[PDB]
Design a protein around this ligand. Structure first.
Ligand code: HEM
Ligand code: IC6
Length: 454
């Protein structure tokens, strides 16, 4: 089969289609038009966007395909270095860091982080308890305060104190601006044009800011000798069972930057979308609120109670189905192979997995794919293989999946226990795209149920 291709712009091929405010949603519309696979060409680049479970289940075969760094990840590597997400699988630092960090990210390690996650979750609840009657909540803004603070505390015992300020932390200003520059280079038809020279100068200054601030955090911890149960201690003390080597200080810095990128808007996007879908689906909200009240019987949730918030876990998975906040990942063929029995690929050929479109495959989910129905996730054995991939695939899957879902389940549970919510503006969904997705301008009113935290 010859695969389709969207409209072209002469020598720029398909590249101008990405010069738009919402490229992921633009790619989803192209997929709707062209189907489960289409070719996408730019100067010096060819990739193929996959959207059906039929083809993606083959792409997830790790004997045939390995993780590729998309152009986006290549630009993020300019400041995330060989941290886990921007490393190639064959780089020595990928497997070393993966072996060392896996026990820090397990379901068992979440027991150790739980107290710190509660610390920040309680600050969010108290903020909302303290609003006056006429005020509202800026949802993505507050969810990002929560997730940033949680990863700072669990990551290296650092308090960003986001609920005490309007103006972001200096590290975050550079990190957000670096991510902004990474996404902007994707959309430049002529990136060598001198009008981008201070953009490039600014990008180099932001890299130096992040590096110096994180390096000081590491030097300060080594100097004090204190042993906290955070990711920094584990990286300073851990040894890779295979090579027997610890991480070096440069790589630890890259891992910290990587966790901070991941724990910022990618996780807060999930909480924002989940609350959006709950207020748009009051019957689902009521069921989740009933579970929260039945399970969260103590003033602050325990680790074990968060594990019992099963329906809230389903709400979060259904929010990830519709708007996965890391919406794509890239693969390359390790050898010549045939995809779906119709599309021959040569060694090195690249694939993009378009996750939001995969998650709308009507042959998997039925006709009602656009509806928010957490009950789809009652039994993971009833979901076909590779139909649901919001955390990536295989050995390159998200190491932070348990962390993100524990944090999100805890805080959504507390939110549902402590407040009734009003969609007071009848908010129209507007998905702002960076390298992640979020519902821009989403606002609600939260009326306290006046249940104490003591
Ligand atoms: C809802 C929240 C999150 C989602 C949807 C998400 C999604 C993803 C996805 C799709 C990948 C694979 C990327 C690729 O194949 O190119 C990935 C990898 C990764 N994520 Fe997450 N993530 C989330 C939260 C987090 C958190 C909270 C952390 C750490 C604190 C984290 C750390 C990582 C790392 C280190 C990798 C690379 C793992 C490796 O390649 O060995 N993520 N994530
Ligand atoms: O399709 C995408 C969407 C974004 C994927 C990477 C962003 N993200 C998501 C989760 N974690 C990182 N990105 C391609 C775009 C592109 C295609 C062809 C030529 C140039 C650019 C890429 O970045 O290579």
């Amino acid at each position: 089969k010859e695969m389709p291709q969207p409209k072209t712009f002469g020598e720029l091929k398909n590249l101008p289609l990405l010069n738009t405010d919402k490229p992921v949603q633009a790619l989803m519309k192209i997929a709707d038009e062209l189907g489960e696979i289409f070719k996408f060409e730019a100067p010096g680049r060819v990739t193929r966007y996959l959207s059906s479970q039929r083809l993606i289940k083959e792409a997830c075969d790790e004997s045939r395909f390995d993780k590729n760094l998309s152009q986006a990840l290549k630009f993020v590597r300019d400041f995330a270095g060989d941290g886990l997400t921007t490393s190639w699988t064959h780089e020595k630092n990928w497997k070393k860091a993966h072996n060392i960090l896996l026990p820090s990210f397990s379901q068992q390690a979440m027991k150790g982080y739980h107290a710190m996650m509660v610390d920040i979750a309680v600050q969010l609840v108290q903020k909302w308890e303290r609003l006056n009657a006429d005020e509202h909540i800026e949802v993505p803004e507050d969810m990002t305060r929560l997730t940033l603070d949680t990863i700072g505390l669990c990551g290296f015992n650092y308090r960003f104190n986001s609920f005490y300020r309007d103006q972001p932390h200096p590290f975050i200003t550079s990190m957000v601006r670096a991510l902004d520059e990474a996404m902007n280079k994707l959309q430049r038809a002529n990136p060598d044009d001198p009008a981008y020279d201070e953009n490039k100068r600014q990008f180099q200054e932001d890299i130096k800011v992040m590096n110096d601030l994180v390096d000081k955090i590491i030097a300060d911890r080594k100097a004090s000798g204190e042993q906290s149960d955070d990711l920094l201690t584990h990286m300073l003390n851990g040894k890779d069972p295979e090579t027997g080597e610890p991480l070096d200080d440069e790589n630890i810095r890259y891992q910290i930057i990587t966790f901070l990128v991941a724990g910022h808007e990618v996780t807060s996007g999930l909480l924002s979308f989940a609350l959006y879908f709950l207020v748009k689906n009051p019957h689902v909200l009521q069921k989740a609120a009933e579970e929260a009240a039945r399970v969260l019987v103590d003033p602050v949730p325990s680790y074990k109670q968060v594990k019992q918030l099963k329906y809230v876990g389903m709400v979060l998975n259904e929010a990830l189905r519709l708007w996965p906040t890391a919406p794509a990942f890239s693969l390359y063929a390790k050898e010549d192979t045939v995809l779906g029995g119709e599309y021959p690929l040569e060694k090195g050929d690249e694939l993009m997995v378009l996750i939001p479109q995969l998650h709308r495959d009507k042959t998997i989910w039925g006709d009602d794919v656009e509806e928010f129905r957490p009950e789809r996730f009652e039994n993971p054995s009833a979901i076909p293989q590779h139909a649901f991939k919001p955390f990536g695939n295989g050995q390159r899957a998200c190491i932070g999946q348990q962390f993100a879902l524990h944090e999100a389940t805890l805080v959504l549970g507390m939110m549902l226990k402590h407040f009734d919510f009003e969609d007071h503006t009848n908010y129209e969904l507007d998905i702002k795209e960076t390298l992640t997705l979020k519902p821009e301008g989403f606002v609600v009113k939260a009326k306290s149920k006046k249940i104490p935290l003591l």
